[PDB]
Design a protein around this ligand. Structure first.
Ligand SMILES: CC(=O)N[C@@H]1[C@@H](O)[C@H](O)[C@@H](CO)O[C@H]1NC(=O)C[C@H](N)C(=O)O
Ligand SMILES: CC(=O)N[C@@H]1[C@@H](O)[C@H](O)[C@@H](CO)O[C@H]1NC(=O)C[C@H](N)C(=O)O
Lengths: 140, 144, 142, 144
């Protein structure tokens, strides 16, 4: 048995893996390792397809989707949630703190706020700039 | 989107998937990333898988649930990802679509810590870290 | 082969099947039959677990979820959508009229309005009454 | 929730699932009814299934995708629904929950027009209409 071990998608997964390994190499839970690992990307504004710095929907709104699943079929999910930088952690709270497994839209934000997460502006100057250039080319 | 799956020291699996979704998607659009069985699926007696690429196609084929059920039936992580991708290829064709417009990939891990990955098109890679260290690997792909 | 044939959940599925059968018995598409079949329940304000008349969330908002899938992997879905009586048809429009397969929340309503669906008050007097009684026993503060 | 699946005169399958969800749910709560693979799944080469009951549990086990893959593996609609229910049962147990608190039902149909159903607890019926007429049937259940 080759353990511990972690796999993640794309080039930036190499960096996310380093964070997950800080947990895995010390005997920590896979659940903690994958949350910490992906939060790194959510936090980084230069990672434009995850959390902070994510390119918005056509209307200029940054809406995030995330889900988490542990070793015993417990699951949590948030979709189309705005203003919260770490949706993977809100998904973990949906899993651990509610009798539900999926919250979306306004209710997902409301639940996040109730859990102490802070409302932040996820739209970076760079993402806003690109969004506006897309509006010109697409003529939307 | 980033998808991450791991097997810890206790031999337990878990996974996480998070994304800002398709750039300039319609307001309210949801991809595969928050859908259990689509962007992510974990079964501690079998293995785990996460998907990336065009979310709509992963939802359409309930991709990761498929990858894990294939491992449950006996496929290695690698074979499970390959067959799953080949199912998206058959469906893409049945729907009269062009594979070149579609990118789907899966990475998987079983209880033994064996892993695998496969995708529709070349160009995708994934990072794997175990006791041999951290590295970027390239899976096979169907569209050649 | 036993066909045409239709199955639906719960007792009210019997009455819903009759509607679906009007399509199936004349050789119509399965897709049309299942949409027509469930719309009957969505339209019925006395069936409180579907569409109009649905019991609201704990804050008194009626939000609907629905998805549809045809014979060739085409899919459409809407979740947590308000004010539209027939979410199954908005799901069908998502499937046929957009490059996406799932819209949720405000975005789902905007799309429905754009497709000509009419905004309506899905909360009935009966459901509101029951909701308020639940607030009393549960003691939840909306 | 009302889920409906049908096989038409052309021999084609389709399905629909629509609900107002769990009464007094948290704002923004979404169950299995709009999730492909959970509340509803259709594969024209195999069959179709739709689920009802506690949506959280159907999502957790990607229920209808499971039912259809079981039919793909050789089970009759009936056997597939039963095996699927039995998986939710084992998982409910693994999660230290009491089966009495959960209700999940599946109804399925294959390409031959054969159909079946199964549920966790007594009390669920489904309606079936074919050329012989329309009838209310009661499937077997696990919690006896
Ligand atoms: C199809 C797509 O958007 N691919 C994105 C890819 O270009 C990018 O390199 C990676 C990581 O930055 O993210 C991909 N995004 C997705 O996988 C989309 C997600 N699965 C979805 O919501 O559909
Ligand atoms: C758990 C639940 O709400 N069950 C409802 C059941 O009591 C009722 O008899 C039937 C038909 O009216 O609807 C059920 N609702 C669901 O199926 C819930 C849905 N699957 C979901 O959102 O999870």
């Amino acid at each position: 048995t080759n353990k511990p071990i972690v796999l993640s998608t794309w080039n930036f997964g190499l960096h996310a893996n380093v964070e997950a390994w800080k947990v895995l190499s010390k005997g920590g839970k896979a659940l903690d390792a994958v949350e910490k690992g992906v939060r790194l990307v959510e936090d980084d504004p230069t990672e434009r397809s995850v959390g902070y710095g994510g390119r918005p929907d056509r209307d200029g709104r940054v809406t995030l989707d995330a889900c988490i699943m542990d070793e015993n079929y417990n699951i949590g999910s948030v979709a189309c949630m705005e203003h919260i930088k770490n949706p993977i952690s809100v998904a973990r709270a949906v899993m651990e703190k509610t009798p539900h497994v999926m919250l979306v839209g306004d209710g997902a934000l409301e639940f996040a706020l109730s859990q102490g997460f802070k409302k932040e502006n996820l739209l970076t100057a760079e993402s806003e700039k690109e969004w506006k250039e897309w509006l010109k080319t697409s003529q939307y | 989107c980033i998808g991450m799956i791991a097997l810890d020291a206790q031999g337990n699996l878990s996974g996480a998937c998070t994304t800002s979704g398709m750039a300039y998607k319609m307001h309210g659009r949801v991809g595969d990333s928050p859908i259990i069985g689509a962007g992510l699926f974990v079964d501690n007696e079998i293995g785990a898988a996460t998907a990336t690429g065009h979310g709509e196609e992963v939802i359409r084929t309930v991709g990761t649930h498929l990858v894990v059920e294939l491992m449950n039936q006996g496929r290695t992580p690698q074979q499970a990802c390959k067959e799953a991708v080949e199912r998206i290829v058959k469906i893409v064709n049945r729907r009269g679509k062009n594979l070149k417009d579609i990118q789907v990939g899966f990475i998987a891990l079983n209880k033994k810590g064996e892993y695998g990955a496969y995708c529709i098109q070349d160009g995708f890679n994934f990072a794997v870290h175990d006791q041999k260290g951290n590295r970027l690997e390239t899976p096979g792909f169907a569209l050649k």
